[PDB]
Design a protein around this ligand. Structure first.
Ligand SMILES: Nc1ncnc2c1ncn2[C@@H]1O[C@H](COP(=O)(O)OP(=O)(O)OP(O)(O)=S)[C@@H](O)[C@H]1O
Ligand SMILES: Nc1ncnc2c1ncn2[C@@H]1O[C@H](COP(=O)(O)OP(=O)(O)OP(O)(O)=S)[C@@H](O)[C@H]1O
Ligand SMILES: Nc1ncnc2c1ncn2[C@@H]1O[C@H](COP(=O)(O)OP(=O)(O)O)[C@@H](O)[C@H]1O
Lengths: 582, 87
């Protein structure tokens, strides 16, 4: 009949057992039954945020009907998953949709109060038969709803509920709101323990139950895209397919929690991966790798090494971010170099990061540049720069440079940030900063540091510059810092080592060009004499390397003088540096 | 345990309807509620003033003596930086 054409019996499928076991949801199914045994407006609607198991509530109710675990008034009923695409499709003629829907309604009256109706996507039922001068499904179902003589069950997302049903109050009051919350962690672990049998029967592999509880735990903590139980189910399924292809292509036979971590790190790259000996010996050689690019300035290397080790070691403060820092020193001591060193350690690249230089924000209102603009105003549909740049890749490094340049009340934003890792952009959603490192640099007591780094300890220098910082900032803000570090002007040996590093990357780029070039150490001594001052550090070394290398060497390369394969000693002139061809 | 419909039944349905706790006090909830001053001091130690104050506020809610035109808690916490206001 017409019920055969447009409806699908879920209860016959659960009678075949071809539906999923549904475990839990007891108050939700009980209130759904309480609404379904009424006199007027029998119709519960499963308002719940997208992917918390709303279809599975009705499927589990169908299974409880088949098992006979319902009250006596529901024993022997039929749940029919109504189809909207079956009804819209065949009707470009006038009245043909209304013909079908009225025939369905007369069949449902004919079934004598035995058919439970399930309508997935109730928001699809709203704009259903919207042809020019045509009733939708609302204008035809709406009689039989509030006489109680239809046993509809809605299932809709809450954002679809606002736009598509709360806009139409008449059909909005015909139903009964059933909030279906995202489950907490422990109950989701229980549900996943229920569903282990299905995936074991599907992929013929086994699952570690610690991997299950780790998938639920890490999914609730780190992934902010989807919602429970959906994200954890997808973790388990994708791990199962990965193990199946590891076996079948070319080891193991189960699904460990390390496989869960590999799935999560493949999905984003938050380094939940366990400390393998390459990674763990890398992490124990933290300061050694930081002094592969940054000579000197030991104490901040120590502090950030400590913070990243406490992050990776499973001792993360789960609400504050990784490290809430503050760098302080005179101009040109490689503060940005240390930040690029962290980026290169973490991501194998300097500019795989976000640097936002706060000298651009010397006015107040650029707060709205990084957090966005409210509803109504100009740049609403774009988001703040900082929030979006986190919202793509949350495991990153957020760098603020020249923090003395901006207005003091930009730093209520970072009060939020360093309190909880939370930030709310102009559209009004939270952005998790629990995988970020915040570094702020200034040159506050640079006169005081250049004056008194000699003949003083590190500690009371930090004390005195902290007093200067309290003269600068707010007591709220500097409480949020994990650790304030102090930089110092470098000796000439540090600048000679930096010149060695610049010669290393120069010879790297000239082997890329294809030239075997060496240097006299006297030329290194002359370059150390040239770009040196205690007041400015190595940016004079930058310009000295720039001029006295990049001008004559590249001038003689383009002069046809430098032949590849020749030994090229960068020896000295009387006042300059000369290359040879030997 | 019942055969009729009472007003506490309506309170149970209305609490399952919106969220607001209008159901009459089961003894686990009420005995948890009396210790509210004690129960806050397992995460906020010290600052007895607003702990007792807010416990008084939520007791004014659940007992039923709230102002039915004004919200329950209308507080202004004031304290130095890091003494557990947010906590
Ligand atoms: N209590 C539960 N017991 C067993 N499986 C569950 C339970 N809750 C959710 N699931 C599973 O979670 C997965 C997704 O739930 P679904 O109901 O299919 O998604 P959904 O509720 O339709 O969400 P939308 O609205 O389609 S985005 C399915 O594989 C369900 O089997
Ligand atoms: N009485 C307390 N009991 C327990 N933890 C406390 C207490 N007072 C402060 N804390 C700690 O305070 C930290 C956060 O305090 P907050 O309330 O955020 O600071 P605050 O009270 O908001 O002050 P400001 O000006 O906003 S920084 C948490 O990490 C708690 O551990
Ligand atoms: N320890 C160091 N290691 C490597 N390069 C350095 C170091 N100190 C200074 N430099 C050079 O000096 C410059 C200092 O950069 P930056 O940290 O931006 O200076 P500032 O201290 O003003 O922030 C860098 O561009 C870099 O080339």
């Amino acid at each position: 009949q017409a019920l055969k054409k447009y409806t699908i019996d879920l209860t016959e499928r659960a009678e075949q057992g071809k539906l999923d076991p549904v475990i839990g949801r007891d108050e939700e199914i009980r209130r759904t039954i309480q609404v379904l045994q009424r006199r007027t407006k029998n119709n519960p609607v499963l308002i719940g945020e997208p992917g918390v198991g709303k279809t599975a509530i009705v499927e589990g109710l169908a299974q409880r009907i088949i098992n006979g675990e319902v009250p006596e008034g529901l024993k022997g009923r039929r749940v029919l998953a109504l189809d909207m695409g079956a009804l819209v499709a065949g009707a470009k003629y006038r009245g043909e949709f209304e013909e079908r829907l009225k025939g369905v309604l007369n069949d449902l009256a004919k079934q004598e109060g035995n058919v439970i109706l399930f309508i997935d996507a109730l928001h699809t039922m709203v704009g259903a038969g919207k042809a020019d001068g045509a009733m939708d499904a609302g204008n035809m179902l709406k009689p039989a709803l509030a006489r109680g003589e239809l046993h509809c069950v809605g299932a809709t997302t809450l954002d679809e509920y606002r736009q598509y049903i709360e806009k139409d109050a008449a059909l909005e009051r015909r139903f009964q709101k059933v909030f279906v919350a995202e489950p907490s962690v422990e109950d989701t672990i229980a549900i996943l323990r229920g569903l282990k049998e299905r995936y074991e029967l599907h992929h013929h592999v086994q699952i570690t139950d610690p991997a299950i509880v780790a998938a639920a735990t890490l999914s609730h903590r780190y992934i902010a895209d989807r919602q429970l139980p959906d994200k954890a189910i997808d973790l388990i399924d994708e791990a199962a397919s990965s193990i199946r292809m590891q076996i079948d292509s070319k080891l193991r036979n189960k699904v460990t929690d390390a496989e869960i971590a590999e799935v999560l790190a493949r999905w984003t790259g938050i380094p939940v991966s366990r400390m393998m000996e390459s990674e763990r010996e890398k992490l124990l050689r933290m300061e050694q790798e930081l002094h592969h690019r940054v000579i000197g300035q030991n104490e901040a290397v120590d502090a950030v090494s400590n913070a990243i080790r406490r992050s990776r070691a499973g001792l993360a403060d789960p609400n504050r971010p990784i490290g809430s820092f503050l760098f302080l020193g005179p101009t040109g001591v490689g503060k940005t170099e240390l930040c690029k060193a962290l980026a290169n350690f973490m991501f194998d690249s300097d500019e795989a990061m976000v640097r936002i230089d706060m000298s651009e924000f010397m006015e107040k209102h650029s707060v709205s540049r990084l957090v966005g603009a409210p509803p109504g105003y100009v740049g609403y549909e774009e988001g703040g720069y900082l929030t979006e740049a986190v919202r793509r890749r949350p495991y990153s490094v957020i760098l603020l440079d020249a923090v003395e340049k901006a207005h003091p009340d930009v730093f209520n934003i970072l009060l939020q940030v360093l309190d909880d890792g939370r930030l709310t952009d102009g559209q009004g959603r939270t952005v998790d900063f629990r995988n970020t490192v915040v570094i702020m640099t200034s040159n506050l007591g640079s006169d005081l540091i250049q004056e008194r780094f000699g003949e003083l300890d590190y500690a009371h220098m930090k004390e005195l510059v902290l007093g200067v910082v309290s003269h600068n900032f707010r007591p709220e803000f500097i409480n949020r810092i994990d650790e304030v570090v102090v930089f110092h002007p470098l000796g000439e040996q540090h600048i000679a080592s930096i010149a060695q590093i610049q010669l290393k990357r120069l010879y790297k780029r000239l082997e890329e060009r294809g030239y075997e070039i060496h240097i006299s150490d006297e030329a290194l001594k002359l370059l150390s004499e040239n770009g040196y001052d205690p007041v400015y550090g190595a940016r004079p070394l930058k310009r000295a390397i720039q001029q006295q290398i990049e001008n004559p060497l590249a001038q003689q390369i383009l002069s046809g003088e430098l032949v590849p394969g020749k030994v090229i000693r960068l020896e000295v002139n009387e006042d300059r540096i000369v290359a040879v061809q030997h």
